[PDB]
Ligand binder design. Sequence first.
Ligand SMILES: *CC(=O)NCCCC1CCN(C(=O)C(C)(C)Oc2ccc(Cl)cc2)CC1
Ligand SMILES: *CC(=O)NCCCC1CCN(C(=O)C(C)(C)Oc2ccc(Cl)cc2)CC1
Ligand SMILES: [Mg+2]
Ligand SMILES: [Mg+2]
Ligand SMILES: [Mg+2]
Ligand SMILES: [Mg+2]
Ligand SMILES: [Mg+2]
Ligand SMILES: [Mg+2]
Lengths: 5, 5, 236, 236
Amino acid sequence: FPATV
Amino acid sequence: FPATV
Amino acid sequence: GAMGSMERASLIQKAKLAEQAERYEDMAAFMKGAVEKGEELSCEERNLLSVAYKNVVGGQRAAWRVLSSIEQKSNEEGSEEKGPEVREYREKVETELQGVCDTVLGLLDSHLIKEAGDAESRVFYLKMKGDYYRYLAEVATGDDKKRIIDSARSAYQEAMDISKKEMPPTNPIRLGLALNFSVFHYEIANSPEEAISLAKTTFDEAMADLHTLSEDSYKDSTLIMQLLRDNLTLWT
Amino acid sequence: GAMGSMERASLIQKAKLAEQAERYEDMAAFMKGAVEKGEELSCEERNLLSVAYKNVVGGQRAAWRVLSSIEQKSNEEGSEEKGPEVREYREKVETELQGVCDTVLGLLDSHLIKEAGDAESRVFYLKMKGDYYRYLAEVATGDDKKRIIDSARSAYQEAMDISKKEMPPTNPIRLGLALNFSVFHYEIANSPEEAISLAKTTFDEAMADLHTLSEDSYKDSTLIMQLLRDNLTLWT
Ligand SMILES: *CC(=O)NCCCC1CCN(C(=O)C(C)(C)Oc2ccc(Cl)cc2)CC1
Ligand SMILES: *CC(=O)NCCCC1CCN(C(=O)C(C)(C)Oc2ccc(Cl)cc2)CC1
Ligand SMILES: [Mg+2]
Ligand SMILES: [Mg+2]
Ligand SMILES: [Mg+2]
Ligand SMILES: [Mg+2]
Ligand SMILES: [Mg+2]
Ligand SMILES: [Mg+2]
């Protein structure tokens, strides 16, 4: 999964 | 902490 | 609410304790109580709110993905019929996830967003609105899926417009918004080119502004820039 | 109970799904439902029950320890008064932990233990009784602390007596019981010499019986023997 903040 | 199962 | 009798300051104190104890459900409940006092949140308090719910919904999303994968495998050719239990339990987790998203969206709508006048606060809350609609979109399969996706897009877009006008390109809130909106494009809106373009332009415009920053601000900005780079690497 | 309407087999199926999803609160609730059907548990079902509650209470114990350490630091000389919040929140976590322990003990008493006639099942349930009284003892500070400690001791001792008569020294249930009873001696009963003696004798008697085992049984036994060794290393 891609990075999110 | 010591090991328990 | 169950937190109605507790002082605002005590709720904040306990949210910080809950974070230290990795008790994120408690942390979220304390922060919900604090929001419901009706006063605006400080920067630190916004961070506590977002950390709490990110961790709770993050766990739910991970569980949902495990269960959805099992469900998908059950519906392949050659898979033995095992009854309704996998679907039921995936639905149970899904309903709980939707509940948490609805709770967060409810706090934003009543009345965090409407009282947020400073760019940092308004962008932060609109980013959160986009994020929680995005989580709803991840599990949506029905009549409303398009409207849920558009709700996420609209919130992110409003946040983007404010961020570009009001904040420097290295601001961590602006950077984090762009990171997440880019993921929305790639994973939700079926727009991988837009995702890539956004991440690249955001990275490059931040790079060009690092020279203006203190050491501490540089650390904060470059951490999020590396996340943009990580996604670009995944996608190209 | 909320699980009263669900089939026993479906509860077991869902407990296994919950485990895969690392949803241990759900797993425990499913297994409680399954126990409350009133039928005896199989070996696999005992494992599911124990895994679920071990993980739930394990998390609570870790949180309690974080909070208790903060509370202790608050009561040192030079520490600024911060009000009742740390104590309150430690108490909240403590009360929830005690609730889970009481739930497990309740399942054992109504009616798992009394129906368990085979040595493996009876030892397993008595070990669990010792374990959950031990968790109650970790947080006990009042009039009943001695009786709670003695309840743990009594359950462990009954399990030990059965295990020595009825099971080989390499049996994983016998080994796990001894490991945990040894920790009870060291951490709860203030008897570190008894803890060490138990762990050493258990290790040595198992070592002498490994020659009787298949490769697979050897793997199972030696894993727990290494835990005994790890504790001995910590303690000597
Ligand atoms: C002043 C104000 O409104 N502050 C709100 C909190 C902003 C913080 C959040 C934490 N920061 C980060 O860089 C990390 C990566 C830890 O997490 C983020 C969360 C959300 C956003 Cl929008 C960005 C970053 C610093 C800024
Ligand atoms: C036949 C029967 O009653 N079986 C109950 C389950 C016994 C299993 C538990 C898992 N095992 C282990 O070796 C580990 C270390 C994973 O965990 C344990 C938990 C509890 C005990 Cl008493 C021992 C070991 C194998 C035996
Ligand atoms: Mg007040
Ligand atoms: Mg649904
Ligand atoms: Mg553009
Ligand atoms: Mg039935
Ligand atoms: Mg108490
Ligand atoms: Mg002896």
